């Protein structure tokens, strides 16, 4: 949806709401995203360092 | 680790050490 990242993706057990798409913690970072194509939601970990 | 470069090390005495050092100046107190 316009925003490029990366990371690993990984399935939740977190519930959006229909309306939602990004998901977000207390940092402000982005850290969760709805599939366009199928409607699931995915959460996003960086890759070590 | 954390989010963007951030990095935390653990302290080189753990906490159960630490308590071991209190125990025995407690008991070299109490004894001596």
Redesign the interface.
């Known amino acids: 949806n316009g925003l490029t990242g990366t990371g690993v993706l990984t399935e939740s057990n977190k519930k959006f709401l229909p309306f939602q798409q990004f998901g977000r913690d207390i940092?402000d970072?982005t850290d969760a995203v709805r599939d366009p194509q199928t409607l699931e939601i995915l959460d996003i970990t960086?890759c070590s360092? | 680790?954390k989010?963007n470069?951030l990095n935390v090390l653990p302290p080189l005495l753990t906490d159960e050490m630490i308590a071991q050092y209190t125990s025995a100046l407690l008991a070299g107190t109490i004894t001596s």
């Open positions: 940092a970072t960086p360092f | 680790q989010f470069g």
